[PDB]
């Protein structure tokens, strides 16, 4: 019933995955599909039915783009080397040079059929084609005339409506050569810049220079019996990107240095957010407190505001010379801290902002997790004569840290790769001096690798960044063993 209809797509997609190329994606599409049919059909595998749809998402949208990203590392993927070879030549073959001169054209109705007219400005002569029907690639031989065509000239709107059929019409003069639509008002001779023969050798039509695909650098290059055509294509390079990480001194320089900041940043985040989160969660549920429910919503509010807009409003608030925080921080005290210029002051700001950002989540967590403690433990403590502080450190805290550990080691993992905070607030903070790659003081491992690949200027090597992305992750694979 449903086995056959879902079995229909296995062969409607599977077979077409083999066709039209795409060999890289045709493999996993069947492996994941055939496993889903085997599990959901016979009742021998029932436990996997609850697991499969979960891991299928994990595979397609987490595991694949990772394996694929590691494949990106073995190649020279760059701002220049960005497309496949068949997309590179597709671009190169598309571009065209103008040969012949321009003519002004007009569209004139003759019953149901149309009529074209060009006008040479050099000679002053006019040319007019026979009656034709719009549609398909057709050639029209124009004839010289002194008379006017019957029927009024078509307005722009009408010529725009028939633009597609008009672009395929290749008109030709009695004297000149082929001429095609160049705008809504003009016709000019536009021939393709290159031609591709039997072998993959592009030959120029204006200069006449031939070009062959150089698969060492990834470009079409000029050969003599050196020009480099620069749309560019992606080609494998092997261990060349991985070796650069172990070879370079200017890439390795901040690489170890920001690692320290990354871990230190996330440790201090976890510690302060848990502290603030827990202490408040204890206080909001405290019996003796009056407006518990009012306090509860107010302390949570920061979380009801999206992270990115908080960071952006903080960025403007933390401005050094101007900006409202230092405006009042110089009125009292008298200091205007260098929140962006100084490495430490910036690093401090990050933590202040992140603590603001991160405490509500820990509070909410502790609020629920706090209910796992039975009330009579504090009643037995009251008999023995313990104060509020004594209760917290001898009972509350040690009884919360165990169920909390996995959630805060998860918080360390989150804040380890907290990309959006750094990019939006500081984007690397103060610049790290004398580096071959773009690097900052507040950059995390995710930020540094991102700068290497995507940041305009100072190199855009997607491959090198992919090599470092793999090198991080595989070394985090030590957290397993």
């Amino acid at each position: 019933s449903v086995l056959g209809l879902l079995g229909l797509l296995v062969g409607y997609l599977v077979v077409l995955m083999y066709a039209q190329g795409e060999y890289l994606f045709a493999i996993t599409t069947l492996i994941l599909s055939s496993a889903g049919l085997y599990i959901f059909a016979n009742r021998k595998a029932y436990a996997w039915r609850y697991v499969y749809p979960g891991m299928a998402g994990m595979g397609l949208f987490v595991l694949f783009p990772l394996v694929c990203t590691i494949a990106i590392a073995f190649t020279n993927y760059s701002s220049t080397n960005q497309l496949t070879f068949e997309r590179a030549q597709e671009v190169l073959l598309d571009r065209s040079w103008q040969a012949g001169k321009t003519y002004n054209f007009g569209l004139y109705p003759a019953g149901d059929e149309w009529q074209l007219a060009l006008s040479d400005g050099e000679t002053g002569k006019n040319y007019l084609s026979d009656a034709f029907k719009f549609g398909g690639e057709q050639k029209l031989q124009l004839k010289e005339t002194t008379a006017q065509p019957e029927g009024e000239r078509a307005n722009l709107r009408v010529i725009t409506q028939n633009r597609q059929a008009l672009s395929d019409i290749t008109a030709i003069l009695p004297d000149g050569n082929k001429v095609m639509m160049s705008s809504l008002r003009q016709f000019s001779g536009t021939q393709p810049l290159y031609t591709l023969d039997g072998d993959g050798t592009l030959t120029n039509n204006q200069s006449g220079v031939k070009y062959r695909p150089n698969n060492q650098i990834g470009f079409y290059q000029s050969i003599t019996a050196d020009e480099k055509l620069s749309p560019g294509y992606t080609v494998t390079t092997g261990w060349k990107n991985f070796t650069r990480v172990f070879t370079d001194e200017g890439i390795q320089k901040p690489f170890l240095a920001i690692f320290v900041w990354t871990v230190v940043f996330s440790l201090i985040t976890v510690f302060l957010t848990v502290a603030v989160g827990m202490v408040l969660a204890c206080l909001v549920q405290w019996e003796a407190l009056r407006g518990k429910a009012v306090y509860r919503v107010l302390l949570i509010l920061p979380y009801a505001v999206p992270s990115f807009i908080s960071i952006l409003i903080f960025k403007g608030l933390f401005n050094q010379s101007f900006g409202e925080i230092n405006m009042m921080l110089s009125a009292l005290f008298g200091v205007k801290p260098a929140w962006f210029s100084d490495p430490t002051t910036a690093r401090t700001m990050l933590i202040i902002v992140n603590t603001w950002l991160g405490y509500p989540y820990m509070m909410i967590l502790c609020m629920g997790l706090l209910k796992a403690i039975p009330d009579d433990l504090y009643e037995a403590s009251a008999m023995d004569g313990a104060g509020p502080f004594q209760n917290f450190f001898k009972i509350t805290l040690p009884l919360l840290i165990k169920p909390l550990t996995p959630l805060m080691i998860a918080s360390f993992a989150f804040n380890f790769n907290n990309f959006v905070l750094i990019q939006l607030l500081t984007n690397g903070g103060p610049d790290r001096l004398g580096t071959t790659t773009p690097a900052g003081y507040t950059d995390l491992l995710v930020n540094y690798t991102y700068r290497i690949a995507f940041e305009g200027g100072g190199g855009q090597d997607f491959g090198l960044a992919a090599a470092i992305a793999t090198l991080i992750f595989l070394l985090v694979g030590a957290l397993a063993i």
């Binding site: 019996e287 505001v305 409202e324 959006v420 992919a466």
Partner: protein, 282 residues
């Protein structure tokens, strides 16, 4: 409810002031936005408390044009309301999807016995630790090949952005499993003896008792998707299909700093998550 020592109020009163000062410290930034959203002009700098109200910034956030006495009617620079509904769609559908996938999977992990259930969960977490930001190159290529076959979940689609998030469930799976292993075993066993199949026990016994955890998982996932930037702005290309996160960063062009217009939209951007919190009192 228990007799209290040392006048009690010594600590109670001093706590009221400490929280009262704390809420002031944390509300300040948000009160700035509200103030900037009412201040006239789009300048980055201005008076802490506005001399006179403006409304102008709130007018173009809601879609109205305004007439400044100088150069005629200025139109709303960005479709903020559309961006708002877009964010709700992508995160809402996203979060239901995440709950459904992660809740069912955890049920098998907590109850059903199958070999290597420990290593798969371990592996799921470790793989998820790798940031999606260092995969954007591959992600674009993924939805590029995927787009030409199933158009409604490819590049420049909300379905694509939703299906992109549907991977991150490992964390939730653990949490939900952990919650399941807290519920009394007898209930599912008593259901089994009554005749209930493993699914019947899931829906009629286990689910209705797990409402609060699934509520939290939804809220967390909903928040997570509302603020996602890297992937969202990578896949979503058309302005009219932007989510709040993608679009809201167009306000702060260094040479076209619309700081006022931004503030009105920023307060408006807090609405969906707050709506969720206020409905989640059950």
């Amino acid at each position: 409810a228990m007799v209290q020592p040392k006048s009690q109020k010594a600590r109670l009163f001093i706590t009221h002031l400490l929280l009262l000062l704390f809420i002031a410290a944390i509300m300040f930034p948000l009160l700035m936005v509200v103030a900037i959203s009412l201040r006239q002009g789009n300048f980055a700098t201005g008076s802490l408390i506005p001399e006179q109200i403006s409304w102008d910034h709130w007018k173009l956030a809601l879609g109205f044009s305004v007439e400044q006495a100088d150069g005629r009617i200025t139109p709303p620079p960005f479709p903020v309301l559309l961006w708002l509904w877009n964010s709700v769609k992508v995160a809402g559908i996203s979060a239901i999807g995440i709950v459904a996938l992660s809740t069912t999977c955890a049920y098998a992990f907590a109850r059903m016995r199958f070999p290597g259930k420990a290593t798969l969960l371990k592996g799921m977490l470790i793989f998820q630790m790798f940031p999606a930001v260092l995969s954007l190159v591959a992600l674009y290529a993924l939805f590029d090949r995927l787009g030409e076959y199933i158009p409604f979940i490819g590049l420049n689609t909300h379905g694509g952005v939703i299906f992109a998030y549907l991977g991150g469930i490992a964390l939730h799976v653990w949490t939900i499993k952990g919650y399941f292993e807290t519920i009394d075993s007898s209930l599912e066993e008593a259901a089994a003896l009554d005749g209930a199949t493993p699914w019947q026990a899931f829906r009629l016994v286990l689910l209705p008792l797990s409402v609060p955890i699934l509520a939290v998982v939804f809220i967390l996932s909903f928040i997570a998707a509302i603020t996602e930037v890297p992937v969202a702005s990578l896949l979503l290309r058309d302005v009219n299909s932007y989510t709040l996160a993608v679009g809201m960063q167009q306000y702060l062009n260094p040479q076209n700093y619309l700081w006022g217009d931004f503030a009105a939209a920023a307060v408006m951007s807090a609405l969906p998550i707050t709506i969720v919190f206020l409905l989640a009192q059950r």
